[PDB]
Design a binder for this molecule. Sequence first.
Ligand SMILES: CCCCCCCCCO[C@@H]1O[C@H](CO)[C@@H](O)[C@H](O)[C@H]1O
Ligand SMILES: CCCCCCCCCO[C@@H]1O[C@H](CO)[C@@H](O)[C@H](O)[C@H]1O
Ligand SMILES: CCCCCCCCCO[C@@H]1O[C@H](CO)[C@@H](O)[C@H](O)[C@H]1O
Ligand SMILES: CCCCCCCCCO[C@@H]1O[C@H](CO)[C@@H](O)[C@H](O)[C@H]1O
Ligand SMILES: CCCCCCCCCO[C@@H]1O[C@H](CO)[C@@H](O)[C@H](O)[C@H]1O
Ligand SMILES: [Cs+]
Ligand SMILES: [Cs+]
Ligand SMILES: [Cs+]
Ligand SMILES: [Cs+]
Ligand SMILES: [Cs+]
Ligand SMILES: [Cs+]
Ligand SMILES: [Cs+]
Ligand SMILES: [Cs+]
Ligand SMILES: [Cs+]
Ligand SMILES: [Cs+]
Ligand SMILES: [Cs+]
Lengths: 310, 310, 310, 310, 310
Amino acid sequence: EPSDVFIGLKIDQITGINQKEENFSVVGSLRIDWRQPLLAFEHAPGEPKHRTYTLATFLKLLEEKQIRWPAFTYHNQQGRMDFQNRLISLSEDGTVMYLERFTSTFQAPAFDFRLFPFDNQLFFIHVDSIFPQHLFRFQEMQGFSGLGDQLGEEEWIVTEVNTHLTTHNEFTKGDASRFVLEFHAERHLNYYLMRILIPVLLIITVSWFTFFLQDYTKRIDLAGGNLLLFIAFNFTISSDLPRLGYITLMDAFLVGTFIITALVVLGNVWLRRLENHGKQALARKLDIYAITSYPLAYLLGALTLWLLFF
Amino acid sequence: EPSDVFIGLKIDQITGINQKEENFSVVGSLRIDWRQPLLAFEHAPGEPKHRTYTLATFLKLLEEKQIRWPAFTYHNQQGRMDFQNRLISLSEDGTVMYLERFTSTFQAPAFDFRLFPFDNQLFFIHVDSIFPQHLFRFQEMQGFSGLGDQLGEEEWIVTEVNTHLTTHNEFTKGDASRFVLEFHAERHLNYYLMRILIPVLLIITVSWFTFFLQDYTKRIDLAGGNLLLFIAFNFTISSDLPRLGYITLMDAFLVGTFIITALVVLGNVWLRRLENHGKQALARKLDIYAITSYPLAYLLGALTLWLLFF
Amino acid sequence: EPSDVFIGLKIDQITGINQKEENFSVVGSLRIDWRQPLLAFEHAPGEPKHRTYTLATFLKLLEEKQIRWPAFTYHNQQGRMDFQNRLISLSEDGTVMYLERFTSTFQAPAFDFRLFPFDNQLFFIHVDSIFPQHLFRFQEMQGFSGLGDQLGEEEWIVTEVNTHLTTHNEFTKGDASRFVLEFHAERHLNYYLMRILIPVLLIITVSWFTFFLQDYTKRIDLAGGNLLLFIAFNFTISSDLPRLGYITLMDAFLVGTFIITALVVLGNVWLRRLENHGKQALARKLDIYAITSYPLAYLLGALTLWLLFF
Amino acid sequence: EPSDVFIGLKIDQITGINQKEENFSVVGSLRIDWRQPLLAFEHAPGEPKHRTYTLATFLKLLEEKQIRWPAFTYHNQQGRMDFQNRLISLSEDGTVMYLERFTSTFQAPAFDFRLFPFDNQLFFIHVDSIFPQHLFRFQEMQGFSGLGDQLGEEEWIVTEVNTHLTTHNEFTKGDASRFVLEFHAERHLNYYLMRILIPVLLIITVSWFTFFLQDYTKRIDLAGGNLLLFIAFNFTISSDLPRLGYITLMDAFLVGTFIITALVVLGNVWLRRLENHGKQALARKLDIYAITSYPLAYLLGALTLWLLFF
Amino acid sequence: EPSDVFIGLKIDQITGINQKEENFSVVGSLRIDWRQPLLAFEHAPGEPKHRTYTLATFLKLLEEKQIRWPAFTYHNQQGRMDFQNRLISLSEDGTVMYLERFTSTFQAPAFDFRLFPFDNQLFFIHVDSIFPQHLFRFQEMQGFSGLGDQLGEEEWIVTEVNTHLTTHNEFTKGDASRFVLEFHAERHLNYYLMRILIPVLLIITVSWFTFFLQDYTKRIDLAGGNLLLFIAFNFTISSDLPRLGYITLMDAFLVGTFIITALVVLGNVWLRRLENHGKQALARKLDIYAITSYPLAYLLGALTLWLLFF
Ligand SMILES: CCCCCCCCCO[C@@H]1O[C@H](CO)[C@@H](O)[C@H](O)[C@H]1O
Ligand SMILES: CCCCCCCCCO[C@@H]1O[C@H](CO)[C@@H](O)[C@H](O)[C@H]1O
Ligand SMILES: CCCCCCCCCO[C@@H]1O[C@H](CO)[C@@H](O)[C@H](O)[C@H]1O
Ligand SMILES: CCCCCCCCCO[C@@H]1O[C@H](CO)[C@@H](O)[C@H](O)[C@H]1O
Ligand SMILES: CCCCCCCCCO[C@@H]1O[C@H](CO)[C@@H](O)[C@H](O)[C@H]1O
Ligand SMILES: [Cs+]
Ligand SMILES: [Cs+]
Ligand SMILES: [Cs+]
Ligand SMILES: [Cs+]
Ligand SMILES: [Cs+]
Ligand SMILES: [Cs+]
Ligand SMILES: [Cs+]
Ligand SMILES: [Cs+]
Ligand SMILES: [Cs+]
Ligand SMILES: [Cs+]
Ligand SMILES: [Cs+]
C-alpha cells in the first residue's frame, strides 16, 4: 500500500529573474512530513521522544533498516543547489519531519515575450517522486506552502500563487507523484517608460519642432541620424531578451519607427528636389502636408501596433 | 526547560554591496557558547579539561549521545556560504564553544533608492533558531558582535551598528529565536559628483556660452545633441540600479534636463522662425529673454527637485 | 565473458548554447541497468525484494564484495557536473538500476560557422566505458534515451535526435564501449533579420534616397559615415562568434558592404571632381549611372555571396 | 607551556589583482612544522620511521588521542579557498610536517589610489592562531616563506617581500599569534601612457593645430566635441577603480582638461563675438593671445597637478 | 631505494585560452602506473586477480598498511580542479593503475605579446612529486601522453607537443621529480585581418579618395575624426590583452596611425593657411606633395614597424 508524503514548499527570496536565459533564482525551504512505522522507537525516562539527525546519518540509518525513502527530484532545477540546512526530526511514532533550505536556479520555460514589456509570466517549481504512486503519494502539507513577503524582487510583482498535485512518467511506466508551486508575475513598466518610451518620444517630438525651420536639407540630416538612434535603441532592447524566433511588441515598435523615419527621409528628399527644380513656392505649399504628416504617421503607427497586439 | 544559546556575529569584511541585485557580501565570524550538561566529561590528572573537535565528528558525537543541537539558519543568506573554520571546543562542564568563519552573500531587501545618490540604507543579517523558544533561547554573546575596522568598503560608509533579539515563526507554530546584526551605511558621493554632476553641469554651462554667438540654428543643433548626451547619461545611471517600479531623485534629475533641453529647442526654433520671416531685429530684442531664460530654467528646475524630494 | 550494461541518456533541458566557447549546457538524466549475479540476495517474508542505496554506500558495498563496477566517463564533459540525484535500486536478482540527474556543460567541437546565420549544427554527448569490451559491453536501454519536450531553448530548434554505440581506445589497448546521444539543431533567424538585415538594408536604401538631392559632397559624407556603421555592425557580429580561422557568410556579407561603400565614395569623389573642374552638365548626365549603379552594385553583391556560398 | 608552531607561506602565482574590488588572488603553499611529543610512535624493523596522512584521517587521529591542533585562520581570506594538497608527514619524534596548497582571493584593504596610476601598494596575507599565545606560539619557518619567480603578473611589479610575527585579539581576551607575509608592488605605466596619455595629448595638440586656420566658429565646435571626448575618457578611467570617496591624480587630471576646454569655448565665443560686432582686426590682433594661451594653459595645468600631488 | 612512478598526461580539450589573465583551460586525463610490492595480495580460484577502488577507500587502505603514496601537485594549476573520474585498479602484483579525469585552468606565464597578433606561445602543465627523488622517481608512461584530436580550440593552432622530466626543489632540500607536458600554439589571424586590418586600411584609403576634392578644411575635419576612430580601435585592442609593461606590434601599429594622422592635420592646416593668405595657386601646386605624401607616409610607416619588429 502507498505511504502519504506531505510536501510543502516556501519561497523566501527571488534572488533574480534572468529573462535572457529564461530562468529564475530563489531561496527556498522544502518541508516534508512522512510517517514510517518501521522507524518508530522506544525511549527511557529522561531520554528524548524526538531524535534529531543530519540527512547523512539518517540515510545511513534507512539503508541499515532496509527502508526505502521517498526519493524526489526538483524537475525544473538548474545548476548547483546550494544547501543551508538538511535536518531530520524523527518522533517516537516514526514521523519524519524534514527541512531543506536551499538557493537554486530553476528553468522558466513558460516565457512569452510577445507582449513585452506589458507581459505577465508564469513561474513554477516541480517536485517529482522518483518512485511511482503505488509506493509513495504526495500530499499537500497544509499551513506552509507559498511565497514570503520579503522576496526582494524589484522589477517583478507577484500577482498570485498556486499549489497543486499531478502525475509524471519520467523514469517509470506508471504514474508518479508531482508537487507544483506556481506563481504569476507582471512587470514594473517604470524602467521602460523612463529609459525607452520618454527618450524615443522626445527624439520624435523635438525632431518635429525643427520642421518649423522650413529647411528640408536639415530635416534629411535629422531623420538620418534619428534612424541611427532607433537602431541603437533596437540593440539596447535585444540585449535584455533571448534571440527569440518570434516578434515582440517592442520589436514591432522599433521596426515601426524605422519605417516612419525612412519615409520622412523619402518625403523631405522629394520637397528638397522641388526647391532644387525652381518649385520653392510649390514645396512651401506642400510643406503643410509634410508638417502635419509626421505627427499623424506616428500616431497612426501607435494605433496600428495597439490594434495588432490588443 | 529551554537552554540559553549565546550568539555572537562579527563582520570582518564587506567584499561588496551589489545594489543592482540588492544584496551584499561579507566575511564573518559566528560565535556560539552553549552549555549542555549531557556533554560533560570526566578527566584524569594530566589529561585535558578541554576537548577540540571538527564540526563533523562533534555532530556525530551528538547523534550518538541522542542530543539535539541548536540548529540555526542565516535567514537572509544567498548562494554558497564558503567556510574557512568550523571548530568546537568542549569543556569538562559541557560548554560548547563554536566558531564559524565564512564568506557569504546576504539579501538586502531594505533598499530604498528614492533619494539615490543621497540615500542611507539598512543592511542586516538574520540568524534564526529552527527549534522554538521552549527548547532553545538565543542570548546576546557580549564582547564580540559588530563590524571590524578593515571592512575594505570604499563607496559606503557605515554610520552605526546594532544588535538585537526577536521572534520568528518560519517553521514552527510557536515563537522561535532570531538574532539580528544590523548596520546603516550612507554613500560617498565623490563618484557621482566627478562622473555625473560636473560633466552634466559643464555640458549645460559651456552650451550656454555659445548663446553669445547669436546663431539660433547653431543653438538648435547644440540642444539636439545635448538631449542625446542626457539620454546616454540616463542609460549610465540605469545600469547601476535594478529596474525599479519607482522614480529616483536621479531619474527626476535626468527627466528635468530632458524637459529643459526640449524647451530650449522649442524656443530657438521660434526665434529662428522670426529671423526667417524678416523679423531679425525683433528676435534679437527677444534674445535677451532666451539668453537669461536658460540659466533661470535650470536653476528653477534644481529648486523644484530639491523641494519635491526634501 | 562480458556483462551487458544498459545505457540510457535523456536531456530534459538545454540551459543554453554558447557559440563563442563552442559548448552547450544541459540538465540530463542518465539511466543504467546492469545485472550482476554476485550482488543477488535472499529476503525474509515482509522484507523488501528491492534495496535502495545512495551511490556512496553502494560503491562501498562493491569494494567489500570485490566487484568491479562499469566505470564510465562523459568524454566531452566540461567543468563541474552538478548532481541532483545519484540513486541505486538493487533487485533480489542482482539487477542494478541507476539514475544520475545532473546539470553540465559539454564540448561542441562540430561547430561549423561557414554558413552562419543559416547554419545547422551537430551536438552530442559521449558516454565511455573506462573498462574494455571484454569486461563490459554497452547496450541501448530501450524506451528512455532522447530529448524532452520542455528543453527551454529559444534560438535553436532541434531537427532530429539519434542514439548509437561505438568503440573508443582512450585508456585501453583494445576497443572499449561508447554510447552516443546526438542531436541536430538549426537557428531561428528572427534575431538576425530584426537586428542585422533590416537595419543594414534600411541604412543602404535611405542613403540611396539622398542621391536624388544631386549633392555629390553630401553623398561622400554619407557613404563615409555608412562605412563606419558597417564597421560597427562588423564588431557586433564578431562578438557572437569565436575568433575563427575561416570566413563566415556574415563576414563576406560585411566585407561586401565595405567594398561597395568604398567604391561609392570613389565614384562621387570623381563626379564632384568634374563639377569642380567646370564640367557640371557632364557630371549631371553621368549622374544617372551613379544613381542606378548603387542599387545594382548591392543587388549584384547579394547574388555573388548567394552563389559563392550556395 | 606553549608549543612552537613553525609557519611558512610561499606565493607561487598572482592570478590577478582586482583593484575595483580591492582584492588579489594567489596560488600558495602553506608549510607548518609542529613537534607534538604525544603523537610520537614506536616502529619495528622494516616499518617506516615517517607516517603519511591525508588531513582528514590525521585530524580523526588527533580527536582520538584528545590532542588540540594549532587551529588557524587566513584572516584576510575571501570566498572559496580551492585546495590542491593537504598532506601530513608524522615522524617517529612526533614532528608534524604539513603542506597546504591552495588558490584563494585575499582582501587588499591597503589600497591608496590617491596617486594612481603612479601608485605603490601594500598587499599582505594574515595567518592567525585561533588559540592564544599560552597554548601555541607561531615562529618563522626559515628557508621557505616569500614569493616565487613565475608569479605571472604583468601589470604589477613586486618591489620587496617581508615576513613578520605579531599578536591579534580576534576571538580571545589575551594575545594570539599572527604570521604576516607582506609585499609591495608598483604599477607598469605602459598601458596608461599608450591608452590615456598619448591619446589625450594628441587630441589637445592636433586641436591646437586648427587654431592656425583662424576660424573661431570651427574652434568652438572643436572644443565642444573635445569636452565630450574627455567626458568619455573620464568614464573609461572610472571603470578601472572603485567608487572612491577621494580624488585621484587621474580625476584631477580629467577635471583639469574639462576646465581648460570650458575656457577655450568661453574665449573663442568672445573672439567670435568681436568679429560679429565689426571688430575683426581687433579679434585677429588678440588671436595671438588665444593661440599662445592654449599651450600655456595646459602646460600650467600639468605643473599645477604635479605640484598639488608631489 | 626509489620506486618508479609512471606519469602520463593527455589533454582531451582546450576549453579556452584567456590571454587577458594569461592562463588556459583543459579537460585532461592523468594516468599513473606504480608498483608497490607491499600492496600485493593472494587470491583463491574464481576470486579476482585485479581489485578496483575509489581513490577515497584506496587512500584509507594505504594509511592502514602505513604506505606512503607518491603525493603529487599540478604546479601551475589555478582555481578548482573539477574531477570526473578518480579510479584505482590494483593487481595481485601490487601494480597500482590510476586514472584522473579533470577540468582545470593552468597558469600560462610564458606569454610574450611582443609580436601579437603574429605571436607563437608556449603552454605547459607541470606535475611535481612532493617527495624527493630518493623516495619516488617519475618516469614517462609510454603510449599515452599528449593532446587529443578534438581539442575544440578555434583561434589557436597547436604546432607541436613535447614531454620531458626535470627536477624541482619546491618543498625539499634535494631534487624532486617533475613531469612536463608542453605545447606550442600560433594564432589564426583571420579575426585580426577582418576586424582590424581591413577596417583600418579602408578608413585610410577611402579618406585618401577625398583628397581629390581639393578641400583642405574637409581634409582637416576628416583626419580629426579618423584620429578618433583609431583611438577607438586602440581601446578595442587593449581589451584583449593584459595591461603589459611592454609595447606590442599592435600598439606600435596604432601609435603609428596616430602620428601620421596628426601630421596630416598639420600639413592640411598649412595648405589651408596658404589659401587664407591669398596663396591659393601655390597651395594647389604644393597639393601634389600632400596627395602623394599620404600613401607614402603610411607605406613608410608599415615598412618601419616591419623592420623594427622583424
Ligand atoms: C537628435 C534629435 C534632436 C532634434 C533637434 C535638432 C537639433 C540637432 C540634433 O543634433 C543632430 O542630431 C542628428 C540626429 O540624431 C545627427 O545626425 C547630427 O549629427 C546631430 O548634429
Ligand atoms: C555638446 C556639449 C558641448 C557644447 C559646446 C559647443 C560646441 C560644439 C560641441 O559639439 C556638439 O555636440 C553635440 C552632441 O554631439 C551636437 O549635437 C552638436 O551639433 C555639436 O556642435
Ligand atoms: C546614416 C544614414 C542615413 C541616411 C539619411 C541621410 C541624412 C544624414 C544622416 O546622417 C549621417 O550620419 C553619418 C553617421 O556616421 C555621418 O557620418 C554623416 O555625415 C551624416 O550625414
Ligand atoms: C576631434 C579631435 C581632433 C581634432 C582635429 C580637427 C579636425 C576636426 C575633428 O572632428 C571633430 O570631431 C568631433 C567629434 O566629437 C566634433 O564634435 C567636432 O565638431 C569635429 O570638428
Ligand atoms: C570616415 C572615413 C570616411 C572617408 C570618406 C569621407 C566621407 C565623410 C565621412 O564622415 C566623416 O566622419 C569622420 C569621423 O566621425 C569625421 O571626422 C568627418 O568630418 C566626417 O566627414
Ligand atoms: Cs533582484
Ligand atoms: Cs533531492
Ligand atoms: Cs547552519
Ligand atoms: Cs555639420
Ligand atoms: Cs561519472
Ligand atoms: Cs535558453
Ligand atoms: Cs570592495
Ligand atoms: Cs585553516
Ligand atoms: Cs595576471
Ligand atoms: Cs594532487
Ligand atoms: Cs573553445
